[PDB]
Amino acid sequence: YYDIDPYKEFGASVELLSFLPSDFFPSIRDLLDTASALYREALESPEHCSPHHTALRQAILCWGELMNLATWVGSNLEGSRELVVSYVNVNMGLKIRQLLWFHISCLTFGRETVLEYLVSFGVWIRTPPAYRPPNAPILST
Amino acid sequence: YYDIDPYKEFGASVELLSFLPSDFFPSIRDLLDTASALYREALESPEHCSPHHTALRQAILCWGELMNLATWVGSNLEGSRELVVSYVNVNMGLKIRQLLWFHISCLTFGRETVLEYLVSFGVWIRTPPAYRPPNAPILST
Amino acid sequence: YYDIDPYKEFGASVELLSFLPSDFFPSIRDLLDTASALYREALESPEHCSPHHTALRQAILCWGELMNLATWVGSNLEGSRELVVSYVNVNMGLKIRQLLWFHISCLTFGRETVLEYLVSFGVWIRTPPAYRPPNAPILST
Amino acid sequence: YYDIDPYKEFGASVELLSFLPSDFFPSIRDLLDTASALYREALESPEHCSPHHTALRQAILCWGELMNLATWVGSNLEGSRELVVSYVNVNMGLKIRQLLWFHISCLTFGRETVLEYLVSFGVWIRTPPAYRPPNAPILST
Amino acid sequence: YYDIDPYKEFGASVELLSFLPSDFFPSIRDLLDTASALYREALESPEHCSPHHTALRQAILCWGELMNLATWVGSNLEGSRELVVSYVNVNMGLKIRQLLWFHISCLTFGRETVLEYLVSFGVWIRTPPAYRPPNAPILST
Amino acid sequence: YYDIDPYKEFGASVELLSFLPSDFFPSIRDLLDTASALYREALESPEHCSPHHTALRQAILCWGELMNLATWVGSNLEGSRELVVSYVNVNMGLKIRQLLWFHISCLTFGRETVLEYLVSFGVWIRTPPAYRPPNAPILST
């Protein structure tokens, strides 16, 4: 009975991201590797630049505690183990990837640029498939 | 793989929070009620004041999706349930409350004041029981 | 139908007063005696100082007409009486004392000081009983 | 053994209103609807303008708790239920309507204007019915 | 879940229209004839004057498509037809007339004057019938 | 016939002193010893400093003549004695100590400081025993 949209300090409420297809976001491993490779200083050093990585830290932490839960259910629990593991991938997996993808993207190209791409992607997906040019991820610095 | 400390950039490394006993932290319902009663503006309005409530949002959200997972396993799954619900209460229940307790405490009394309280509590608990003053959590605005 | 909070325009929403336990508030006779002894001028003289005593007047009047109703049901009505007298004591007795207790307390010590006392009492009661300082109502002019 | 006249900060002691006939005041529903329709901002917003609505709030609240008492005696209690309900309409009903009518009227036309109308109404009712012109509610902004 | 009422840009929220009795508003035919006779260029010419006629247009269109649906159900459906038509007039017809009545009235006599007329009629109907001066719709340029 | 309050012209009406329990006041011998040890100059030298010791003189004198009456009834009178000696101890013993206790206390710590102590003690005692801090008489120069 608490309803808070994470994406309100930066605009682009949660309803905006619902347009993007579920399978459009790349896998968790690629996003984690991108965050680690591009951003090792910011995540490790205490110097504060923006709330983006400030929230990215606990995003990674909630993902990690979910991974530890998966390891626990694999090791200590009893068929019934694989099904819960599959569920968290499809249930929390979508949310975690959305959190990771938005914050990484807005750090590289800027938070303003991703806004227009989100708006344009909404227009392109609303048109019926009878006539739509092939659109791909188009972001430029 | 690799570990990062969320409590950083406010001082108060993770090692300091290990001073406090596990059972000292109050129950989740009290923290949620206090956060609601004291703050309905910051959690809902888009205005930014500090990263504290910024991280509080994802903390509440990760707790909420944990509750949703508990509801799903209650509704769909088969003696194997109550052990899972108890486990997350004793394992993630401690971890989640730590994030919530620190942030609400440092919002009212300030992030500077809570630091010496952690130091003072550490000193108080390390003394032998043969002579110790009965201590209660002393915080005044 | 619709609800309004009397404690508003002084801060101190209704949710804050839910922190205090029901039995904490002292008995009606003590509050009436304290109000009489400390204030016979404000309650009688037409001079206005603050809305506090202004609302205190109607509070006392609603309590008085409740007492008159109790006297009437004692004098005129028929085992069905004592259950009514007990019910109003346990239902309206709590509600009336809340109005009286807040107003007299914020007159002597000030409306600003009572606020942090509510916050401090909330913090004190939310901690687990395994370690808590024995607290008494600390108010000093 | 407490005697306080509510109407002393604004003048027009309780003895002044005793002149007006009991059935002159309109029904509670009409006064509540008038207060709601004309004054939704003042009753809801914390901004303070005058003690009028400041007392109107607890007037409505005491009426509401009386209504809840009526609902309780209707639902939980056992002939003996209708009679107490009828009594509160004639006993507290007159007082509540007087409180509501005075404060609503003095907000619209001003607190000074209602004073003259009360004085003149006293003169008109003191004359024996042998010769009195028909007088009606006459208030103008 | 959508909750919004039209009467905000002009003030006078929907609660104000609840004072005036339902049967007070005249029938749809008279309002339509008045709108057609007094304002034919405003409804037809694209010239902009105020949002009043701007909303009046879709008011008329929504009423007209309701009439078209009524004709469709009359011609196509099978007792069950008449009750639906009587239903829409008593349920939807009242709401439509409020839009037309407010906008037509505020164009001739002005949006300012009609506001005081609303409260004046509201308080006038609340006074007891034993004393009320004879009042009718009083609107003068 | 008619009653006057001695404690007047220093604030602290008689009603305030009714807050303190009867047995709280210490025994007469301790008060006399404290008055002697702290003040031998004021009680003997003719110099005037305040009405406090001025009234203290007649207080001690009325107590002394009561003691003389006790000695006389012991020496001259006849089971009827000890009931009289006990009665004056329980009836005038309370009254005399009140005069002495107030005056010596307000001489050392000052008449201004003792006022809030009476208020603070009243607040402390009115709270229910379910939660109260153990209070001792806190007075510091």
Residue numbers in the entry:
A (entry chain A), B (entry chain B), C (entry chain B), D (entry chain A), E (entry chain D), F (entry chain B): 49 to 126, 278 to 340
Pull verbatim passages from the article behind this deposition:
HAF was expressed in E. coli and self-assembled into a spherical capsid form. The purified HAF preferred the T = 4 symmetry. A Fourier shell correlation (FSC) of 0.143 was chosen as the cutoff for resolution determination, and the final resolutions of HAF (T = 4 state) and HAF (T = 3 state) were 3.86 Å and 3.60 Å, respectively. The four subunits forming the asymmetric unit of HAF (T = 4 state) are colored in red, blue, green, and yellow. The density map of the affibody was not clearly visible since the connected linkers induced flexibility of the affibody, causing the structures of HAF to appear very similar to those of the HBcAg. Each linker composed of 10 or more residues made the affibody flexible, and thus the structure of the affibody in HAF could not be clearly confirmed even though the molecular structure of HAF was obtained. As a result, it was confirmed that HAF, in which the affibody was inserted by manipulating the spike tip, has a similar overall structure to that of HBcAg. The overall structure of HAF was not significantly different from that of HBcAg, except in having the affibody on the spike.
The N-terminal domain of HBcAg (aa 1–149) can form a dimer and be assembled into a capsid with an icosahedral symmetry composed of 180 (T = 3 state) or 240 (T = 4 state) subunits. HAF is composed of HBcAg, along with histidine and tyrosine tags for binding to gold ions, as well as a tandem repeat of the affibody for binding to EGFR. In the HAF sequence, the affibody was inserted between α4 and α5 of the HBcAg, the spike tip of the HBcAg. The affibody used in this study specifically binds to the extracellular domain of EGFR with a dissociation constant (KD) of 5.4 nM.
